[PDB]
Amino acid sequence: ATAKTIDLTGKAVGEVELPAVFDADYRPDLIKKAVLAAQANRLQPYGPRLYSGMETSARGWGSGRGVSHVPRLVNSSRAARVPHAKGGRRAHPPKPEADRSEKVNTKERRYAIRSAIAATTDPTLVSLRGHIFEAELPIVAVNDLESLERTKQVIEFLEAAGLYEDVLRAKYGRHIRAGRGKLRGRKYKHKKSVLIVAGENTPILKAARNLSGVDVVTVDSLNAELLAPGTHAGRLTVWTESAIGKLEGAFQ
Amino acid sequence: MIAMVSKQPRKQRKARYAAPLHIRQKFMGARLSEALTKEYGTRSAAVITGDTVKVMRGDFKGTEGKVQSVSLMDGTITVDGVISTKVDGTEVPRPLNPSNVMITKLEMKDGRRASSIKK
Amino acid sequence: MDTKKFRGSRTCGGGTHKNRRGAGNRGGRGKAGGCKHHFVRAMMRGYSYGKHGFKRPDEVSRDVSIVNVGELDELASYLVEEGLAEVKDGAYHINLENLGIEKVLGSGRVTKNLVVTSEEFSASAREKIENAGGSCIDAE
RNA sequence: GGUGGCAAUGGCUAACCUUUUAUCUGGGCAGCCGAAGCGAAAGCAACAUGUGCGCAGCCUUUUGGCGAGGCACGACGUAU
RNA sequence: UUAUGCUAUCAGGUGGAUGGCUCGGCUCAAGAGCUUAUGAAGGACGUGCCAAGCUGCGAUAAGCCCGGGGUAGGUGCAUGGAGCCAAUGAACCCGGGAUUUCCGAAUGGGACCUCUCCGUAGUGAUCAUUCAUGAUCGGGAACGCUCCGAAUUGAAACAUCUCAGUAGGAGCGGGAAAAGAAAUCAAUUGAGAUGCCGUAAGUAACGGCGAGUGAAACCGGCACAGUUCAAACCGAAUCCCUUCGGGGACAUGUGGUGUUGUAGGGCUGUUCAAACGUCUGGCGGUAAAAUCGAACUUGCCUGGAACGGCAGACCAUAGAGUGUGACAGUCACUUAGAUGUACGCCAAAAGACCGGAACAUGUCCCUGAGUACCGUGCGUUGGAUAUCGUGCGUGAAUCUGGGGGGCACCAACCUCCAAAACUAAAUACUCCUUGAGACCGAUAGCGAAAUAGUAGGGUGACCGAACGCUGAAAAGUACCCCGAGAAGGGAGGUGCAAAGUGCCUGAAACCUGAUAGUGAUGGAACGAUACGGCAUGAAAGGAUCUCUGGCAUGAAGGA
Ligand SMILES: [Mg+2]
Ligand SMILES: [Mg+2]
Ligand SMILES: [Mg+2]
Ligand SMILES: [Mg+2]
Ligand SMILES: [Mg+2]
Ligand SMILES: [Mg+2]
Numbered sequence A: 001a002t003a004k005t006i007d008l009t010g011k012a013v014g015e016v017e018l019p020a021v022f023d024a025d026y027r028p029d030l031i032k033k034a035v036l037a038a039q040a041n042r043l044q045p046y047g048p049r050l051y052s053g054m055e056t057s058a059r060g061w062g063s064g065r066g067v068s069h070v071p072r073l074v075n076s077s078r079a080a081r082v083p084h085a086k087g088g089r090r091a092h093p094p095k096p097e098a099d100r101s102e103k104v105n106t107k108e109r110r111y112a113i114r115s116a117i118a119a120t121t122d123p124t125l126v127s128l129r130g131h132i133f134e135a136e137l138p139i140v141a142v143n144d145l146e147s148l149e150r151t152k153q154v155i156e157f158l159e160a161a162g163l164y165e166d167v168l169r170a171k172y173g174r175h176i177r178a179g180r181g182k183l184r185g186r187k188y189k190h191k192k193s194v195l196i197v198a199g200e201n202t203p204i205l206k207a208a209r210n211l212s213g214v215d216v217v218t219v220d221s222l223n224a225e226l227l228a229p230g231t232h233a234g235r236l237t238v239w240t241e242s243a244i245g246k247l248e249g250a251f252q
Numbered sequence B: 001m002i003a004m005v006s007k008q009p010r011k012q013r014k015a016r017y018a019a020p021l022h023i024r025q026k027f028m029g030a031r032l033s034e035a036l037t038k039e040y041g042t043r044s045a046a047v048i049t050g051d052t053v054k055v056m057r058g059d060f061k062g063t064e065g066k067v068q069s070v071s072l073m074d075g076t077i078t079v080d081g082v083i084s085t086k087v088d089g090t091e092v093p094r095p096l097n098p099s100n101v102m103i104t105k106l107e108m109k110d111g112r113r114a115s116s117i118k119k
Numbered sequence C: 001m002d003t004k005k006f007r008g009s010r011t012c013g014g015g016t017h018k019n020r021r022g023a024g025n026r027g028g029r030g031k032a033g034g035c036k037h038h039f040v041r042a043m044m045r046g047y048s049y050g051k052h053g054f055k056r057p058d059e060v061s062r063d064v065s066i067v068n069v070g071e072l073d074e075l076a077s078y079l080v081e082e083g084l085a086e087v088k089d090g091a092y093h094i095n096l097e098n099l100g101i102e103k104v105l106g107s108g109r110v111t112k113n114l115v116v117t118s119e120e121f122s123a124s125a126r127e128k129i130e131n132a133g134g135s136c137i138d139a140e
Numbered sequence D: 001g002g003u004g005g006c007a008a009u010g011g012c013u014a015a016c017c018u019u020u021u022a023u024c025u026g027g028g029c030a031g032c033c034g035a036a037g038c039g040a041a042a043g044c045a046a047c048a049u050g051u052g053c054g055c056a057g058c059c060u061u062u063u064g065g066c067g068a069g070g071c072a073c074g075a076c077g078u079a080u
Numbered sequence E: 001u002u003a004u005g006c007u008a009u010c011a012g013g014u015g016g017a018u019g020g021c022u023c024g025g026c027u028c029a030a031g032a033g034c035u036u037a038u039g040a041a042g043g044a045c046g047u048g049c050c051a052a053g054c055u056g057c058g059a060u061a062a063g064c065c066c067g068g069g070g071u072a073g074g075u076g077c078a079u080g081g082a083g084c085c086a087a088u089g090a091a092c093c094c095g096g097g098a099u100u101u102c103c104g105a106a107u108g109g110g111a112c113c114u115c116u117c118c119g120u121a122g123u124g125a126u127c128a129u130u131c132a133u134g135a136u137c138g139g140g141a142a143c144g145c146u147c148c149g150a151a152u153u154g155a156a157a158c159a160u161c162u163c164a165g166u167a168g169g170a171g172c173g174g175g176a177a178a179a180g181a182a183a184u185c186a187a188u189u190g191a192g193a194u195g196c197c198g199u200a201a202g203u204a205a206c207g208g209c210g211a212g213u214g215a216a217a218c219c220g221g222c223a224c225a226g227u228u229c230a231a232a233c234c235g236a237a238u239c240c241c242u243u244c245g246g247g248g249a250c251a252u253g254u255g256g257u258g259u260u261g262u263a264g265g266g267c268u269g270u271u272c273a274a275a276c277g278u279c280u281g282g283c284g285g286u287a288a289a290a291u292c293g294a295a296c297u298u299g300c301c302u303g304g305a306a307c308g309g310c311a312g313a314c315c316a317u318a319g320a321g322u323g324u325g326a327c328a329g330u331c332a333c334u335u336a337g338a339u340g341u342a343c344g345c346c347a348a349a350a351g352a353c354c355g356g357a358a359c360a361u362g363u364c365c366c367u368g369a370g371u372a373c374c375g376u377g378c379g380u381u382g383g384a385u386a387u388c389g390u391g392c393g394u395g396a397a398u399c400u401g402g403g404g405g406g407c408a409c410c411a412a413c414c415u416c417c418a419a420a421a422c423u424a425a426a427u428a429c430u431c432c433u434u435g436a437g438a439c440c441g442a443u444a445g446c447g448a449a450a451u452a453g454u455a456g457g458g459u460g461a462c463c464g465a466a467c468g469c470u471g472a473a474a475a476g477u478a479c480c481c482c483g484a485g486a487a488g489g490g491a492g493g494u495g496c497a498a499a500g501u502g503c504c505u506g507a508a509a510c511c512u513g514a515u516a517g518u519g520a521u522g523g524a525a526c527g528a529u530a531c532g533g534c535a536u537g538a539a540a541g542g543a544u545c546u547c548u549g550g551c552a553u554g555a556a557g558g559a
């Protein structure tokens, strides 16, 4: 329906009418479909080498020797090339020619994204996603937020709006994950706190770029993953007036 | 130097461990005192054998002294008065990492040291 | 299939472990054995032997696109809204040459005066068009 | 098959452009399927319910009435 | 005190799994892409103060010299003794040079001889030329082009077919290569080089019409590019080398014009003026090492060791990480962002160089031959009487001409000009460079976490491993005793901890000892259920819970 405009002091200084994207229904299933499709589309092929365990020239010994029939080396008895021999090929390993990508049609993907955008207004789901805040959703801001070029100003705005608690939770709950993720480059396990959506490319993109667990994107790059990470809708999103005015026919 | 061009831990550790001698000169750095960084325009520099430093972490916290030895390979600096006593009883000096120490006094026996700290 | 369901069942839903060996547990490879031991399956799936008829060249053969007079009559106003046809003197003047359809068939009813021009009209399409007061014109 | 999107004014886009580096957003009507079938082919071209019964459902003097879908005819296109 | 034994647990040995870590591997993407007779790659041998392997280098031999960066230590994997080098700026990295034994394309002759013979001092072979000089030879992970060319297998047999122009082979060759500017595709009228991608489409087509194989055009895209010869007419008007004197090619034609289809070009005349292209140029981008780049190392607590808990203060175009005696935005390297950068690469303004396009003209001239086409055979193809190749035979016409329009011939209509030649970009691949990863985590991932194509096996083609982990710091066990002992043991000490030299945790199998039960009258799938003996029962299990009785209500049954 309609919301309020909050300036840099944090107080609401004007009533804004939300576009028709905001009054969409709640669809966790289509949110999950879009989220899984994007996560599959970002994937990457892997798999062993073309002849892992298979470049040997081993042949079986046949019967009459008291050993099993597995392939063995031509000049020793050591077994090779079979999936149960030591050093043998992985039976059914991953292939680099696999196609892990998924697909959602553009109409239902847009319906999923609109369902995610409507979820940002809902206080119960936004407070049900671990987001800790006292602001009154939706948090629309006047368009001065685009042109502030230092993260201290972003900190002051988030404190004024009642959203700095979730930023602190993202920063101080950012914790080391377990297992093989750390060695492969995924040391810490992160948190999602604040999502800023400016109308166009401004210095707020560089401003809140370094906020802990805070993603900032223009309305054009508003995929459903930003609106609902990990198939759960209810991201604590901060919009502006410019994003609101560039949103009347965003996904219809 | 290891950039955010690569963020993988294995790549960064390989670049550090196989880094050449001219990149291992920068490994010896440490936090200066407040006075030195205020009077030298940079927040830190590299520690040379001889300048007085104070170990601000470990078993020898706050022990100012003269860096007796330094190895560019292992990235280990040995401090006067920060040593170990062996079973023989002889005092073998201990190697401390250069990040553990904080410089208090410089060593201007090198005229090139001024351009080494900055520019 | 469901790999994790059959972890423990040995044969993995295949009966004897002597089943599931190669092409012999299916009766050849592909749609083979269609004259000897898969005759009835060939009949059931359409693999039965034989050739029938001929083909004309595709360069001369043409498949015309059709539309019935009921479809034209019951959405001619959508044509005038869309701009593919207009209304003169109460008769909806609709040309088939630009809608992509090249034949007209009289499936259904005609109510409004449709001045339809097309490549070729069926006899009953001509009858239903002329009964309603419209006209048919063959367009080159 | 289960779950969904859109739905005769139908559905999906493929390559590809946009990448602020493989995500993503907006495009991309070529094309495939559906929309009319029968026939080897030339060729021709149909029902926007004419009728009967009747479940759920609604109404009802609780036994009947109306009855989507369903079942059975009739009519029509084309081949022989 | 019952041995040999049995079962369960415990301690220790042997052992090296699990767990944790990891400078390796794999996969994908993006760049860049040749080298070699000015002697490569690859190999043999040598090469270090103590140096065996690997790596690097070559009798100047883990090196030498010069310009740039860096600056205080260096002396490889591999911080031992003694020396040496370095503030005359080394080590190290980028750039430019020097040295660069023998073999190897190996090239003065020769190889069971990596050396040897002649020394008249080495251009071996095939080639071009003015006989001055120059080219080719080998290697390169795959890709590219040309030619030759199977079988397993599928058809549930098998031969046409398929497997498959695959596997393999020979030649050539570059950063790309091939293709390439219609004697084209269409359809009644259109399009306007080629390549690659999607679709047409499992359609046409082929086929024991079985199994299977299987396009193109239209269309939508990536990228955009058009031209040069032969000839007509002219006739040495030229071209290459050079010691600048001259020589060589060439009248068997160097060069100019010209290059094509509702035909073009030449000869005759007329009109306009001159497009694209070649060269000079380096304004500016790009470009070597590399430079700078924020803010804590504050108090107490535990700890050996704080990055941690409790308090406190700051940075963030920079909360990506890695190291650091444990969880690090603020300690170091860094990071977002700004810089510097020689040689090279691209490069627009501003100039010089040749010129191009039409008009009318006609009994004029030229416009590719063993070629197009045809007969026959074979291969190949989806190509069917209608694919392309080429073996043999035949074989034209010249603008009043010739070809195509999926059997042939006639006619109309449409469309084009072969048999001569060049041509970026879009595309393909990964030795190499960088990045990334729901990838593997040491019996996995390359075979190799590389003293790994190594040890080892084979005459040979060739086959082919295992081995990772001390601790924060060696603080790597002083002194004493036993012992023949630089072995080993005890005592003793360093270490928070022996973790006590393939040393992190340290399983089971197996072995040794102890504890409990039983045991030299005893019957076997080693156990399930119930009841007892012995030992345990601290934690995690019960406390109206355990044992023993009375009272109340008591289903089925019932003395
Ligand atoms: Mg392996
Ligand atoms: Mg059976
Ligand atoms: Mg077969
Ligand atoms: Mg060659
Ligand atoms: Mg060509
Ligand atoms: Mg084939």
Ligand SMILES: [Mg+2]
Pocket (backbone or CB within 6 Å): E318, E335
């Ligand atoms: Mg940073």
Ligand SMILES: [Mg+2]
Pocket (backbone or CB within 6 Å): none
């Ligand atoms: Mg291995």
